[PDB]
């Protein structure tokens, strides 16, 4: 009766959820190269009036995409460097005692061994220092820890892994939508959507227990989880103020280069210059014991105004789980965080010792090991704690006192909080509608 006909339109502003490959883009570092295409210096962020969309940070393929690419890049940049297979020999070791402080006793070992020279038919006696974490006893015979499980390679002493903020950008035909609501918590509709060409800069920082160098929420400390109720799930906490942490490795180190083949050099840790001290991190007591008060108030929102909130130490397991894995300056620290989670909250300078390790299983895989060459001199790091990874045990439904503990994580979780506001969609420009025109 209406006599309407199908009219075809092309260029219709309609889109559907999609999963594609984002291409990277920055502004001797590995991310200096794998993010060359410069971002626009003035990204074209477009506010969309009257657009509401559903977001889900726990099902975000951008998180998965970053994870795959960080690992893939990592193992490509180290591909051409010298293998340390020849170092997997029987070592003769003793304790380092020369000016070692009492707190470090037995931590370092002085090992001598028979290793080849550049000529196939000649050997040399060399020695180097190792941290005890990487040396396994076989009266003085020791083995490197990776020898019964994996191949060990030397990280290229030229390749930098200092985090670089990187941006993800959409390919043609795609767009990245950003959630700009306030107090968005993981999932559900976000009645404030803006379209961008690229994400903000995100640093590919790797850590456990404490989240470092991210965005500081916006208004208030926020608690997010896939489930909350199910204690098997993690709770991510994002701070609205940084807690500054100062970490150091005080020993003044030197290096020696040992030929292990024709054009193949091994970097060994030499004698420590001066007094030998323990690595550690400083957290301001008066900032931490205030920042947690904000976390506690937000937890009561879900756990009860009259409940008891307790922060306990970490649980059992290996260093990668029970300690704070901290990568800084090029060295790997394993810090003891028990001094940060020791309190009971009711309704009404902190020093963390650290260990240093050189043989690192960078990703939880079997068959590879990375040797981190030592850094000359001393190192000091300054960083922003921007959040927590917490787990929960009990209370709630039984008898008060929910216990929260710092936990480990899946790597992804450290990026999940920054990729949090973004979703990838594809544009579908064709569509039809009834009109009054006929050819």
């Amino acid at each position: 009766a209406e006599n309407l006909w199908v009219t075809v339109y092309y260029g219709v502003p309609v889109w559907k959820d999609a999963e594609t490959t984002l291409f990277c883009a920055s502004d001797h570092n590995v991310w200096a190269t794998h993010c060359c295409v410069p971002t626009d210096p003035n990204p074209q962020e477009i506010h969309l009036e009257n657009v509401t969309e559903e977001f889900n940070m726990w099902k975000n393929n951008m998180v998965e995409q970053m994870h795959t690419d960080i690992i893939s890049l990592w193992d490509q940049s180290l591909k051409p460097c010298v293998k340390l297979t020849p170092l997997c020999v029987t070592l003769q070791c003793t304790n380092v005692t020369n000016n070692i402080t009492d707190d470090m006793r037995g931590e370092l070992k002085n090992c001598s061994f028979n290793m080849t020279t550049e000529l196939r038919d000649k050997k040399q006696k060399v020695y180097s220092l190792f941290y005890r974490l990487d040396v396994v006893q076989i009266n003085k015979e020791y083995r490197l820890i990776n020898c019964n499980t994996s191949a060990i390679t030397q990280a290229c002493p030229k390749v930098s892994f200092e985090p670089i903020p990187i941006h993800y950008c959409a390919p043609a035909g795609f767009a990245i939508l950003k959630c700009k609501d306030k107090k968005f918590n993981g999932t559900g509709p976000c009645p404030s959507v803006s379209t961008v060409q690229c994400t903000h800069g995100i640093k590919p920082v790797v850590s456990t227990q404490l989240l470092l160098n991210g965005s500081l929420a916006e208004e208030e400390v926020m608690i997010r989880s896939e489930n909350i109720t199910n204690n098997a799930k993690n709770i991510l906490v994002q701070f609205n103020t940084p807690v500054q942490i100062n970490c150091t490795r005080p020993n003044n180190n030197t290096r020696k280069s040992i030929r292990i083949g024709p054009g193949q050099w091994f970097y060994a840790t030499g004698d420590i210059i001066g007094d030998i001290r323990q690595a550690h991190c400083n957290v301001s007591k008066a900032t931490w014991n205030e920042t947690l008060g904000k976390v506690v108030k937000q937890l009561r929102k879900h756990f009860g105004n009259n409940t008891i909130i307790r922060f306990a130490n970490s649980s059992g397991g290996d260093l990668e789980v029970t300690t704070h894995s901290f990568n800084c300056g090029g060295e790997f620290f394993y810090c003891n965080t028990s001094g940060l989670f020791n309190s009971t909250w009711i309704s009404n300078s902190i020093t963390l010792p650290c260990r240093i390790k050189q043989i690192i299983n960078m990703w939880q895989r079997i068959g590879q090991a990375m040797y981190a060459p030592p850094i000359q001199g001393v190192i000091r790091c300054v960083s922003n704690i921007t959040g927590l990874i917490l787990t929960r045990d009990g209370g709630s439904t039984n008898s008060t006192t929910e216990t929260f503990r710092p936990g480990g994580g899946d790597m992804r979780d450290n990026w999940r909080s920054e990729l949090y506001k973004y979703k990838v969609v594809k544009i579908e420009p064709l569509g039809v509608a009834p009109t009054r025109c006929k050819r």
């Binding site: 092309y10 260029g11 035909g173 006929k438």
Partner: protein, 129 residues
């Protein structure tokens, strides 16, 4: 202003069709040596081209070519959406509309293809006459 019309009504949004159309088509040794990232960049570029061309081929087949708006001779079925024009062009977005039509997409496309085949045969015969 690429998706700026997203919250606009279907009628108002008809004025930005070139804004969306122009954005649907568009290092050195790093990607060439890292022959594991190049063969992502090539895949991304090839796909964008293929998607663009599939849309252009459908428009061509339906008799709509080189235009953003085309009238066709296929009548609208009230059974695909029993709404009047004042419910569609005003107070409704294109995103909402797609949800209303979705299931009938293939019916409509098939009808558009058939209409053009008949139109082309008639043109050839009329010109010969």
């Amino acid at each position: 202003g690429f998706l700026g019309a997203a919250g606009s009504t279907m009628g108002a949004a008809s004025m930005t069709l070139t804004v969306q159309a122009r954005n649907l088509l568009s290092c050195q040794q790093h990607l060439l040596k890292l022959t594991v990232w190049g063969i992502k960049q090539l895949q991304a570029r090839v796909l964008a081209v293929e998607r663009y061309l599939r849309d252009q081929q459908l428009l061509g087949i339906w008799g709509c070519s080189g235009k953003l708006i085309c009238c066709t001779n296929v009548p609208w079925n009230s059974s695909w959406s029993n709404r009047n024009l004042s419910e569609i062009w005003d107070n409704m977005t294109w995103l909402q509309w797609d949800k209303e039509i979705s299931n009938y997409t293939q019916i409509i496309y098939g009808l558009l293809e058939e209409s053009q085949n008949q139109q082309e045969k008639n043109e050839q015969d009329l010109l010969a006459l």
